[PDB]
Amino acid sequence: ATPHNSAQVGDFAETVLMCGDPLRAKLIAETYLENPKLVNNVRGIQGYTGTYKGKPISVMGHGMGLPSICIYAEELYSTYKVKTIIRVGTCGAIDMDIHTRDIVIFTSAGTNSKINRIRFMDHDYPATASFDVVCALVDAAKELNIPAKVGKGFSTDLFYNPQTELAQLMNKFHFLAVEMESAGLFPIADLYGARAGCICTVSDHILHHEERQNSFQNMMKIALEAAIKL
Amino acid sequence: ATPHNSAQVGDFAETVLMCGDPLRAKLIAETYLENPKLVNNVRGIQGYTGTYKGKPISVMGHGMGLPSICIYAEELYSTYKVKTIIRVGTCGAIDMDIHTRDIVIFTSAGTNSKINRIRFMDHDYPATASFDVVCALVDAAKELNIPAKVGKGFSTDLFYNPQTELAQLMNKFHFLAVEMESAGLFPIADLYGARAGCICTVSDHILHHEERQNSFQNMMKIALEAAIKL
Amino acid sequence: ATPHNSAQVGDFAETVLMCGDPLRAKLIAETYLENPKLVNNVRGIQGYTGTYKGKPISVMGHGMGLPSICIYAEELYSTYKVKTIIRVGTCGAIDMDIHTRDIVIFTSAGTNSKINRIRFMDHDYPATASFDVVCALVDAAKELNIPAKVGKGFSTDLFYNPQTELAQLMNKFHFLAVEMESAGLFPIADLYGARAGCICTVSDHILHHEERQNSFQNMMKIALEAAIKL
Amino acid sequence: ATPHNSAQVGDFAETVLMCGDPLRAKLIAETYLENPKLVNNVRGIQGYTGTYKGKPISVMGHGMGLPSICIYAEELYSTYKVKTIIRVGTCGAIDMDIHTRDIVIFTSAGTNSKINRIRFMDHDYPATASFDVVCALVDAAKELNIPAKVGKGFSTDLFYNPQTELAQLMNKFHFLAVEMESAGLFPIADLYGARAGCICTVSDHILHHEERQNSFQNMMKIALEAAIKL
Amino acid sequence: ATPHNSAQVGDFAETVLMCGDPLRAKLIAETYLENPKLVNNVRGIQGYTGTYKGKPISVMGHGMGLPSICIYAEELYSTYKVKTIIRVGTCGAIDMDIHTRDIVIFTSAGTNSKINRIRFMDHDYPATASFDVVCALVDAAKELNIPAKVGKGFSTDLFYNPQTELAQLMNKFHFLAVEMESAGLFPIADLYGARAGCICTVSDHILHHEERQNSFQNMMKIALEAAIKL
Amino acid sequence: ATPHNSAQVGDFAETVLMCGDPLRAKLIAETYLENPKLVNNVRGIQGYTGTYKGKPISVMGHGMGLPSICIYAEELYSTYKVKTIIRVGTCGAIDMDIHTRDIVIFTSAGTNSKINRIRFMDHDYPATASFDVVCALVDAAKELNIPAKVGKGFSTDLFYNPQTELAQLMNKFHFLAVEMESAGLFPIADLYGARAGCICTVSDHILHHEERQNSFQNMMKIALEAAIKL
Numbered sequence A, B, C, D, E, F: 001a002t003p004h005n006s007a008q009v010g011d012f013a014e015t016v017l018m019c020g021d022p023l024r025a026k027l028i029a030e031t032y033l034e035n036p037k038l039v040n041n042v043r044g045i046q047g048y049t050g051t052y053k054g055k056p057i058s059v060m061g062h063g064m065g066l067p068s069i070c071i072y073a074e075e076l077y078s079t080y081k082v083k084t085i086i087r088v089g090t091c092g093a094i095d096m097d098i099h100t101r102d103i104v105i106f107t108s109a110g111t112n113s114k115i116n117r118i119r120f121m122d123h124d125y126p127a128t129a130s131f132d133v134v135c136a137l138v139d140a141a142k143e144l145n146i147p148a149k150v151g152k153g154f155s156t157d158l159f160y161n162p163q164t165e166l167a168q169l170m171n172k173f174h175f176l177a178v179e180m181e182s183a184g185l186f187p188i189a190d191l192y193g194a195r196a197g198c199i200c201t202v203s204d205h206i207l208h209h210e211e212r213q214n215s216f217q218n219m220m221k222i223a224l225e226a227a228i229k230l
């Protein structure tokens, strides 16, 4: 159907969970979904569709970086008529009060990318997560009683950031963590009148040096339960 | 104490409601607060402090524009040790599905201002409202059962915007309304580890031409009740 | 007539003096004008119109910041057919050779705002004061024999500026003082084929720590006399 | 060794061919290399190392987008001491004189990304391919007598570009094709005193609508032969 | 003494008139100066020094463009201790009310160059002509009774401007004419605590199609007389 | 024919060598060309046309800076139907491994100018030298067996650069030298479907302090021989 997806309209559920690592998306499909079927593996992206508690749901990788997730997200909403995309994954803590293994739910994401300025006449677009998804993710966290921090995320274009002062500036403004897709995902969902959200498990801290499965599995429970709520 | 506030530390409540119109802040203090006392009138800003349901609360004008509310907000958090600032006021609808008299709760605010780029090393800062305040405002709206739309706001530097195409671009991305302070307020609260939020009543629509008291009074109920919740 | 002015065309004189502080504009109207009449008090802006030496003249507040004065200035030229706007007020000295209580006449104003780049296809717009107004202000200063410094001003969006190095950079380039409106005012006057100028009394120095009525009253004499000359 | 590579220093050859599609890198390793060994499959990236005409050589995917290839390229030069990286892949024709199935060798790449401005104090960095690699690629093309077009490439952050006029602007300036990594790759090689180049087969034209294996296999011959020359 | 000037400190007068055309500077030195001596001809720049009404004065070419005049102006103030530089020359009318052969005195100059943003922390620097020089030029014009228009100039980096809409935008904001140096000259003078100004004769109109010696000679009279006044 | 060229179509050869210094272009015409004829001296630009080894060739100055060479280059390609322009001249070494008297051939040029962003919708245009000209220049260097360094150049708008850190940043990225025109020249050639290149002799090093005729004459041999090859 598309240059990056061999599946046809209907092969994907209206709700898709996406992580950067394709092997992780496969693991997720084999571990949490019932009767998972590979609906798209163009570029080894591992796109699956199965069911969770009887409801249809798809999991697929989205590569690293805004440009990558932008291709997939726009194709999903536009062609496969997906309604909700929840980015699930890892991130790097910024805030001194955030620690490795913590789970973070993004209210929004800042970025050093130029993409949003391009789509928004060179102004400040607030890459905001859909309030419905933020609420579903937080309620799930409350119902499951899993501690989660809610706040600003930062989607960097530079994993290895030359601007070494940025980290501290972000800590001062209390950005929770850093990943590489949210800022791109959120605006695309707005454009298509759809929904997007993000939840991550801190795999490491960037301002200092600091069982990792429990954290990840807990995050998955939240994302999955929130998917059912939506 | 400051160049724009004659009051002393302690004269302001930890929660302050702010609107652009100083005469409106006076009206609010005389109408909803018990035993309101003028604590600051430098520049006729009408800063009052009284009580709502027994709890301390202050209301004060903040002028129009990011530069203005930036002066007041930073002085409040920094010097008067304020903890929560809720901007209450009017705005201009953008989205075709938003109508005059609707009440809007900002999850965040975009802007054509350069302020945030200055504070954030020329990158994209997501001026996001404090999740606590967004939730308090939404719960209040639910408890009072007052219909309210939650979503992106836009803080413009140009009430009379030369870029006439922007309005439609914003409608496409589904920005709810336009005001002139939120984008400045939110980041300052982050810097001080404090909280900020915004709720507005649409006084007019910018994409087409379309009792106004009820809407305003309803918005006030939400803001006041949410203040108690925080 | 407008969202920020209740007055009707003709209520304002062709020459309007504006300061940020509305209470100051009221003081000015009561102190220097004969038979002052409140023609607009929307948002407590204190818009008055009286006469000076028999000629019609109006005084009105303009709030703090480019966004604010932009609303008022554009409405004045456009709707109320005003011809000349002279910003009168206070500012913060930058140049080491400028001292508190000095009077400064802006030839132009630089800015960290994005407004002019928005109106000028992202290029460098030289926010220049109208030569007629600069001359009238300087002749008035010469005729009254009141020492006044003429030169560059700077309109900041950030009263509390994060970029602490800027102050010294500006001293090196010899910017006289800092305020928050001139850069916005001047271009709007150009667009409407009208005139704008600015004169301020240094209320404090930003690079070091350093009767204030005389300075202010002297500035008023210059502005008033210059208004008659125009 | 790194967050995206499980291999150890020495597992990679000093010359690495990279394409976006991981399944393509696997195909390449199985088709053109002798005794290929999987040295890194973190995130299913398919990193192989075998030999071509007796010389060591590695092939690995790099995902789509500058942010992605930036992570891999910097890790390769920095940690695995790689010396030459040749991006091999597909692209979209821009120039009216370029047709589907044509092979293009980039002299350099333009971009709408902000990455290089971040690394280069907000100025214009000319993402240029290493002259050694351009020459090796062109000589290989001449020796094999395979028609190839040499010129400017463009690395976009937006596969689905909102700025629809850009395509024509690029045709006017004669940009050959569009991909999503070169502009990021080239500067990183400069920083590490290493080499980078790019050769692509046009899989489609973006300005109009227009056996594909021959073109791809021919491109591979050029890249492989050029690798031996370096 | 410098890479672009063979003269030594003292060879130049404290006041230097500069035009783009070196042959014009030679003509000026031979026509208006008494006992002109070639003090610098590096790059055929035609730097002369003679006397006007007994006072020392130098004339020298400055090439076309901000980068060019920036080299010369900075060397003059810095090394040759020059105090005043008056750019004399031609320009292209923008404003519909300005006609070919009109004489224009710049109060300031806007620009599409990036130079000033580089020197001014990426903010808006108002390239303003020294008030002393503007006054001297205008008084000279009044005393000689030669009609001259005073206002904004524009220093373009692109004589052949791709942005064809800019011309009309500038007419709307009432920019008088276009040249290629003023915006660069003015800030350099500020930095050195020196003075700079500009006066030009419109050689053509850019918005429509419309003895040229009289205009030029009149401009020279003004510049020369103003030089004596300074 | 043009505002800067008195010559008529046909007076210029299809290949033109340009240097900043007009006196240098004259020297070149008198030293290396047979029967040189002055075809254009507007602004003392010294435009000559003669023959080298029987083939027509022109030499002309282009002033200093992108704005200057942009005027000349565009007029040459557009009006005088020139096909190839080779900038010949001096530059300042950046890279620690480059020494005074070295000859450098630009593959491309970076810049702090805004010109290319203006012509390229505010994106990153890679000012790249025409591959044909780079090859001709390098082959000539090889055939003449004259050591020459090939790589990135940098065209600055500020000979006296305020950003003192830039020099080191450029050394880190291995920019060879600095001049003031290449970045402007290359894109113009692309637009006209013509060719441009650059070769310079390092006249000094900017990072430290370090017969100059031999170097210059050698560079000329390369440029001249390369002209014949094209």
Ligand SMILES: O=c1[nH]cnc2c1ncn2[C@H]1C[C@H](O)[C@@H](CO)O1
Residues within 6 Å of the ligand: A020, A063, A064, A065, A090, A091, A092, A093, A156, A159, A178, A179, A180, A181, A203, A206, D003
């Ligand atoms: O610390 C991090 N910085 C940037 N990205 C991170 C970090 N931790 C996890 N990620 C995510 C972003 C990409 O999807 C990938 C980069 O390793 O994994």
Ligand SMILES: O=c1[nH]cnc2c1ncn2[C@H]1C[C@H](O)[C@@H](CO)O1
Residues within 6 Å of the ligand: B020, B063, B064, B065, B090, B091, B092, B093, B156, B159, B178, B179, B180, B181, B203, B206, C003
């Ligand atoms: O439509 C609007 N555009 C911009 N600002 C608006 C609009 N409606 C209300 N406001 C707010 C922003 C300022 O505080 C003031 C401008 O009239 O009132």
Ligand SMILES: O=c1[nH]cnc2c1ncn2[C@H]1C[C@H](O)[C@@H](CO)O1
Residues within 6 Å of the ligand: B003, C020, C063, C064, C065, C090, C091, C092, C093, C156, C159, C178, C179, C180, C181, C203, C206
């Ligand atoms: O020092 C100053 N910085 C910025 N603005 C100033 C300063 N002094 C006076 N002002 C003016 C600008 C605004 O109108 C208001 C800010 O206090 O008063």
Ligand SMILES: O=c1[nH]cnc2c1ncn2[C@H]1C[C@H](O)[C@@H](CO)O1
Residues within 6 Å of the ligand: A003, D020, D063, D064, D065, D090, D091, D092, D093, D156, D159, D178, D179, D180, D181, D203, D206
């Ligand atoms: O036409 C294209 N536009 C952008 N990227 C392209 C095009 N054709 C191939 N590519 C490359 C860039 C990415 O690596 C991926 C996008 O499909 O494949």
Ligand SMILES: O=c1[nH]cnc2c1ncn2[C@H]1C[C@H](O)[C@@H](CO)O1
Residues within 6 Å of the ligand: E020, E063, E064, E065, E090, E091, E092, E093, E156, E159, E178, E179, E180, E181, E203, E206, F003
């Ligand atoms: O119309 C014009 N546009 C740009 N520059 C102009 C114009 N008229 C005169 N000039 C000046 C600027 C340069 O010094 C040179 C360009 O021809 O002469």
Ligand SMILES: O=c1[nH]cnc2c1ncn2[C@H]1C[C@H](O)[C@@H](CO)O1
Residues within 6 Å of the ligand: E003, F020, F063, F064, F065, F090, F091, F092, F093, F156, F159, F178, F179, F180, F181, F203, F206
């Ligand atoms: O070191 C240099 N910096 C900038 N430009 C240079 C340098 N060396 C030579 N040039 C060239 C650029 C201009 O054409 C002129 C400046 O002196 O000569």
